Amino acid sequence: MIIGYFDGLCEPKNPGGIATFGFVIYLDNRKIEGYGLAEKPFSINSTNNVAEYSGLICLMETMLRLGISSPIIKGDSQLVIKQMNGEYKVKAKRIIPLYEKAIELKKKLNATLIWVPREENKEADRLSRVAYELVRRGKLR
């Protein structure tokens, strides 16, 4: 069963920090993972939720492009998972287009999205932090 995980962070302030994401895709014999900048650094449009959605979108885009289908996708954002499952409304103007992109991807992938606690999402967390550190080192821009 293909399982992907995503995460996003925004530090050292939220909002107005550096927003990064990370994701990991588990296949039985190999792993593919990704991490990066979600928004322009220190911009007022870097937010935690934008970062989380960006990690989700990049995860599902990567899956789609690789020909993965019917994955299970796990994250530790209750808000994002509940929005993606039709259980919380999306009303924030900057989240709406990201939610829409993610919903189209979820439909195309026949993805199932479930919440797990933070301590079960450590790899994707770690990768969002690696991305953050890389931005601080001028290695992602």
Residue numbers in the entry: 1 to 141
From the paper:
First, we investigated in detail the stabilization effect of the Sto-RNase HI C-terminus, by measuring the stability of a C58/145A variant lacking the disulfide bond, and a ΔC6 variant lacking the six C-terminal residues. The shape of the spectra was almost the same for the wild-type and variant proteins. The crystal structure of ΔC6 Sto-RNase HI was solved at a resolution of 1.66 Å, as shown in Figure 2B. Two molecules are contained per asymmetric unit. The root-mean-square deviations of the Cα atoms for the A and B chains of the ΔC6 variant against the wild-type protein were 0.446 and 0.436Å. C-terminal residues 142 and 143 of ΔC6 Sto-RNase HI were not observed because of disorder, indicating that deletion of the previous C-terminal residues made the new C-terminus flexible. The denaturation temperature is 102°C for the wild-type, 93°C for C58/145A and 78°C for ΔC6 Sto-RNase HI. These results indicated that Sto-RNase HI is a hyperthermostable protein with a denaturation temperature beyond the boiling temperature, and is destabilized by 9°C by elimination of the disulfide bond and by 24°C by C-terminal truncation. In contrast, the ΔC6 variant shifted the curve downward and flattened it. This is the result of decreases in ΔH and ΔCp. Because the C-terminal truncation eliminates hydrogen bonds and hydrophobic interactions, this result suggested that elimination of these forces at the C-terminal region was mainly responsible for the decreases in ΔH and ΔCp, resulting in the destabilization of ΔC6 Sto-RNase HI.
Ribonuclease HI from the hyperthermophile Sulfolobus tokodaii (Sto-RNase HI) is a monomeric protein of 149 amino acids. Sto-RNase HI is highly stable, and is stabilized through the C-terminal tail. The C-terminus of Sto-RNase HI is anchored to the core region by one disulfide bond (Cys58-Cys145), several hydrogen bonds, and hydrophobic interactions. The C-terminal residues of Sto-RNase HI contribute to stability through local hydrogen bonds, hydrophobic interactions, and a disulfide bond.
